[PDB]
Chain A
């Protein structure tokens, strides 16, 4: 009875992986970029990148590596998805037609297994003899690369080492050999195994285990003539090869964790290393000659080159040019010069690519024109943190750098400004408190304020602090809606994290307030025990504290509710009234929660999203002054976001990248049955939704009606993808699903992945086919197939044009339908 439609408004922009090689031709240097479900293929030119082909996959690309078996004239591509779909792909071009051919495909999921902590790892031997996969603790899966293994059949080898950190195949070995770092009660260690195909087992490796740094975290397989392996830790870098052992502990790397690496020289003579502060280093391997013509490593050095965006991945292209693929900020092309500039940096940015992710909060505002909504998102993290302003006309994006992490956003029309919660990292100073690592919004405001309430900390106990502790400093920023200048910054208390934000009117009071919910955070507490609701008024360029309310917990969520304020505090939902004396007073409480993280409201009804008790339906009772529990979804779901679609339809998103929709149980004959919400819609989205919000970017056509879908809810995700959910009639749902099945018979899936499998609801507890959701992206894909294929799609299809009787559908009818659907976003 709930039928919904989901469509992409902005494809994911974060880069999860990037590799180079010779994929499109033996002579071309290609760049391949993974953006979750998308694979982008470029040719590297003297000036930059030429796009050649972009594909979507029915899966989250989890592994992407080029390789070239014997008899192939150019590299092949292995991809593994998060649902364990494995495939080998080949690039094919003839004329203007570009097709990605599937050479091999199969699902390598086990029936049982616990996904590993450091995630899926996939590696390929340098001689293309086999693929190795670390999917589950205690197991190593091997896919032999036989020409006949078009089904990608595999076998498992027991791993004694249950906690593997990283693993690579070594170069220069007559037998396939892995080198990996693992963790046990004795510490971290590095070990190797040879891989025997005959025995389908490991054999003893060529060199003995070594202890490594407690935080040894990455393995690099060094090519010939060096061979061997480099192990990267937080304070040290070591190289191992047989009886060779060389370690350095350069202090420069200790300030920020190196998290990615890339080979610069084909021979391994130089590597780049990037850290969490966006610093970029060169790692240089010094050779020592030997009388027998072998080469050994003479020394290792690290040199700071400069700063980039915080890199998820790095790829050297050619000619000193580097692609910096970022998931937390914009990606970049940068140039490396041999000589530094005035400030001592060898890095110069050449080009920037927008990244909206992570999208942590957002709101829709008609900033310039009535009816023309624009989205203002909290995007990014640490120095890449920003606001992004998105408007149609495909989309124009304005970037507002903040140089710190945004957390929440609201709009205050009456003050013509936004309130934004943000946090910055500071470290201990030489003699005093802490110092910021760079200027940022909270330190560059036109005016600034600090809290002075002394009730925040009770019975504080001094605790010894080790040197170099970083701290989070939280602030409320007041930002002009036109200029995006930092008008004001209010700094919160030490150890106080601001979690929730509202702008609203309360009671009979004509003033509009900024309201913030916080938590006091101490390292040894399993859950916060202290927090505040603080009511501020913005006037004359500054924030004044109007009122406070102390609670014994974290104020996760707040929402304006019928002129009163509803707030969630750990396992409680509490309703406050705003008094004539400008204080919050509790009217009523609801207690039957584990942790109430998410709230939305409509009328007197309340949808509560829990940490683990997924959705709840409460009613406020105005003639009783209390809450009534109406119903709950008794299926467990680990929520990341929720939304009220209407009085009868409730949208949830959960941590396994699925959406679901709940409804009241219409066939309930008892109060007990009426208390069970039914999950009537299910959909594997493949994205992590951080925020739902009502609104639309498409221009609204006033009195447009007799349209396919009704309502518009936008949502923002970790990957920077923006999507839209809307509601469907029964007839439209049925029409589009018939279309889906027919489309699914015609569209070629990259890797021969079934759409139904991809979109099937899937968690570690249950896997079920999708229901109640149409894949709008797929629907739109009707418009890009050839006309004979369109005619095939609509063959023997009964269709009701406008209002009337059903008849045979033509391609033009469905072209028109799909064109109308594409304009809703």
Chain B
């Protein structure tokens, strides 16, 4: 809540009206105002429970309040706010078809791509009707773990529990399925700014940057960053220059454009691994250099702050140090996930059997 220097709010706004001050300096002081009001998100708005634990999350891009969410048994929900029309639901097998990756269809917002334990990378309607499968294991005990899609490139990609990665187009056209890592692929994501270099994360304590179009030669990769422990996720910026990374033990790493190999600053943090808990995935603000993560306290962690509680913290990217913290009794579980709107006005969080809404105060 309490912060480093700032002042001169309308001065800065006016000095931008003068051309005196630079937009980054401007943008810096408005990051602060979000941090200020984010200390006034302290009242929680909404909850929405259902059956088996959550495993993924995704916003409607155009819409702030509409969100898609999935279960530990492959059960999707599509919840919007200010509607009161009892949101959509699709059920699944319930036991062994756990959804693990989920991103909207950029073309048809009432469609969506889904990655499950069944081994069926699919595109499906909120009314249940499957439009198309995209890939398959064609053999049990083999399924998909990671998934993402592009639209400027119109490119689909998914990971596996073995370490080989698959890349599709919006209409099939499979030219991929080489191997990239030796163990399960935790997370995967593409650049929004450029279109044709990939990153990928796996259990192998390594994250790998690829150039999907140039490389076809079985680890004829571009870069590869080692890590002390396995990694849950690694997410580019919206800016694309600042690649973020989360370990499994306790760390966050900040890999920028400039010489991907070496890092910038280490944000140690407890978000510890566990079997029945959903894996933790930090995330970016779409429009600031902020980072938001959920805390999983561990007595073994060398805590800088002496009070250790499960909560959501708010970091600055290019600095390294925290800026705000979100706590709420009657929410004393652990949020594995957290996902601001692309809007950036609102925040959703996913706890086991509980989804949470974190908007501002009603003055």
Interface residues of A (CB under 8 A from B): 14, 110-115, 117-119, 136-139, 156, 158-159, 327-328, 357-358, 360, 381, 407, 472, 497, 499, 519, 521-528, 554, 556, 571-572, 591, 594-595, 597, 611-613, 634, 636, 638, 640, 655-656, 672, 676, 688, 690, 718-719, 764-765
Contacts and interface: CB of A to CB of B under 8 A. Distances in A.
A118 B30 CA distance: 18
Contacts, number: 132
Interface of B: 3, 6-11, 13-14, 16-20, 22-27, 30, 32-37, 62-64, 80, 83, 191, 193-194, 238-242, 256-259, 286-287, 342-345, 362-363
B85 to A, nearest CB: 10
Contacts of B241: 112-114, 136
A472 B194 CA distance: 46
Contact of B194 (A14, A111, A327, A497): A111
Contact of A634 (B27, B62, B83): B62
A613 B341 CA distance: 12
B25 A117 contact: yes
A527 B9 contact: yes
Nearest to B6: A526
Contacts of A358: 17-19
Nearest to B258: A138
B18 A360 contact: yes
A495 to B, nearest CB: 12
A521 B17 CA distance: 18
17 contacts: A112-B240, A114-B241, A118-B22, A138-B258, A358-B18, A358-B19, A407-B14, A521-B9, A526-B35, A527-B36, A611-B30, A638-B27, A640-B17, A676-B63, A688-B17, A718-B18, A765-B286
A634 B194 contact: no
Contact of B7 (A523, A591, A656, A688): A523
A613 B36 contact: no
Nearest to A635: B62
A631 to B, nearest CB: 12
A636 B287 contact: yes
Nearest to A676: B62
B19 A327 contact: yes
Given A526-B3, A526-B9, A613-B345, A640 B194 contact: no
A636 B343 contact: yes
B32 A111 contact: no
A640 B241 CA distance: 26
Given A158-B258, A640-B17, A718-B18, 14 more contacts: A112-B241, A113-B257, A117-B24, A138-B258, A328-B18, A497-B11, A521-B9, A522-B7, A523-B7, A525-B7, A611-B33, A638-B30, A655-B16, A676-B62
B25 A571 contact: no
Contacts of A528: 9-10
Q: Is the interface of B mostly helix, strand, loop or mixed?
A: loop
A819 B317 CA distance: 54
B3 A360 contact: no
Contacts of A138: 256, 258-259
Contacts of B25: 117
A594 B13 contact: no
A813 B24 CA distance: 48
Contacts of A117: 22, 24-25
A105 to B, nearest CB: 22
B39 to A, nearest CB: 9
| Most chain A CB within a 10 A radius of its CB, from B14, B83, B194, B240 | B14
A382 B345 CA distance: 37
The 9 A-B residue pairs with the shortest CB-CB distance, nearest first, are A112-B241, A138-B258, A718-B19, A526-B36, A111-B194, A523-B7, A112-B257, A358-B18, A112-B240
Contacts of A640: 16-17
Contacts of B242: 114
B36 to A, nearest CB: 4
Contacts of A499: 10
B26 A655 contact: yes
Given A594-B37, A612-B30, A718-B18, A112 B239 contact: yes
Contact of B17 (A114, A158, A718, A765): A718
A572 B286 CA distance: 24
B33 A595 contact: yes
A676 B26 CA distance: 28
Nearest to B359: A592
B23 A634 contact: no
Contacts of A497: 10-11
Given A139-B258, A634-B64, A112 B193 contact: yes
A591 B22 CA distance: 29
Contacts of B23: 638, 655-656
Nearest to A552: B363
Contacts of B35: 526
Contacts of B83: 672
Contact of A111 (B26, B62, B240): B240
B223 to A, nearest CB: 13
B17 A119 contact: no
Contacts of B26: 655
B258 to A, nearest CB: 4
Contact of A527 (B20, B33, B362): B33
A527 B29 CA distance: 10
Contact of A571 (B10, B238, B363): B363
A597 to B, nearest CB: 7
B11 to A, nearest CB: 8
B363 A764 contact: no
A556 B7 CA distance: 16
Contacts of B64: 634
Given A595-B33, A718-B19, A158 B193 contact: no
Given A612-B344, A634-B64, A634-B343, A110 B257 contact: yes
A579 B160 CA distance: 70
A765 B238 contact: yes
A111 B192 CA distance: 10
Contacts of B342: 636
Given A110-B257, A112-B193, A719 B19 contact: yes
A656 B22 CA distance: 11
Contacts of B63: 634, 672, 676
B42 to A, nearest CB: 16
Contact of B10 (A519, A676, A718, A764): A519
A119 B259 contact: no
Contacts of A688: 16-17, 19
Contact of A597 (B13, B62, B257): B13
Contacts of A113: 241, 257
Contacts of A638: 23, 27, 30
B80 to A, nearest CB: 8
A360 to B, nearest CB: 6
A289 to B, nearest CB: 45
B363 A572 contact: yes
A526 B18 contact: no
B10 A526 contact: no
Contacts of A158: 258-259
Contacts of B14: 360, 407
A43 to B, nearest CB: 30
A519 B12 CA distance: 14
A572 B363 CA distance: 9
Contacts of A718: 17-19
Select the residue from B26, B83, B287 with max chain A CB neighbours within 10 A.
Answer: B287
Nearest to A525: B7
Contacts of B10: 497, 499, 519, 521, 528, 554, 556
A139 B35 CA distance: 30
B4 to A, nearest CB: 11
A692 B64 CA distance: 29
Given A112-B240, A136-B258, A612-B344, A360 B7 contact: no
A519 B11 CA distance: 11
Nearest to A718: B19
Contacts of A110: 257
Contacts of B193: 111-112
